[PDB]
């Protein structure tokens, strides 16, 4: 149950500081409604993992590095999943929250 | 200790776990728009005349003893607790409280 508080300028691009340990693999998600029993929507799916989610709005500026238009997401919470192994069977989640300058 | 992630059932009262260290005094605030340069609105202070005044239409603050909220993110801004060792709150650190919903 870790939290990552970061600061950026509202409505401007912000390269999100990845709070996963170094050399961990990370996947970025929206947790719908910030409800833990709700779906985790994966962001920045290149193709195909199985479902690609595209955003109507401008939340995502870039997927490399993961860069957002500095704002709190309304659909749910911004969560990063950290895993040492590529299969992601053992992992930990960190929620990312913004203070605005 | 800058962020405190907590879990509750949405739209039901939640006694907020105070994340200040033990023996510290705590005051609860909304930071308007979560903007560091914006006003801090103190909760559980309800004493008057002023051109801008803040009301709680949805009973976001359920109780001030213990500090208990309607389990929700306040739209006006972020929930912040100011922790101070001294009663004068001259030396302090703020902790933002964030909710995951059950
Ligand atoms: Na929320």
Numbering used by the authors:
A (entry chain B): 18 to 65, 69 to 121
B (entry chain A): 18 to 64, 67 to 121
Cite, word for word, the article reporting this structure.
SARS-CoV-2 ORF8 is a 121-amino acid (aa) protein consisting of an N-terminal signal sequence followed by a predicted Ig-like fold. The accessory protein ORF8 is one of the most rapidly evolving betacoronavirus proteins (1–7). It has been shown that ORF8 of SARS-CoV-2, but not ORF8 or ORF8a/ORF8b of SARS-CoV, down-regulates MHC-I in cells. The structure of the SARS-CoV-2 ORF8 protein reveals two novel intermolecular interfaces layered onto an ORF7 fold.
The core of each ORF8 monomer consists of two antiparallel β-sheets. Punctuated between what would be β3 and β5 of ORF7a is an ORF8-specific region of ∼35 aa from residues 46 to 83 that are structurally distinct from ORF7a and other Ig-like folds. These residues are responsible for a third, ORF8-specific, disulfide. The dimeric interface amounts to ∼1,320 Å2 in buried surface area. Val117 forms a hydrophobic interaction with its symmetry-related counterpart. The ends of the interface are stabilized by a “clamp” loop which makes main-chain hydrogen bonding interactions between Phe120 of one subunit and Ala51 and Arg52 of the other. The structure reported here is of the Leu84 form.
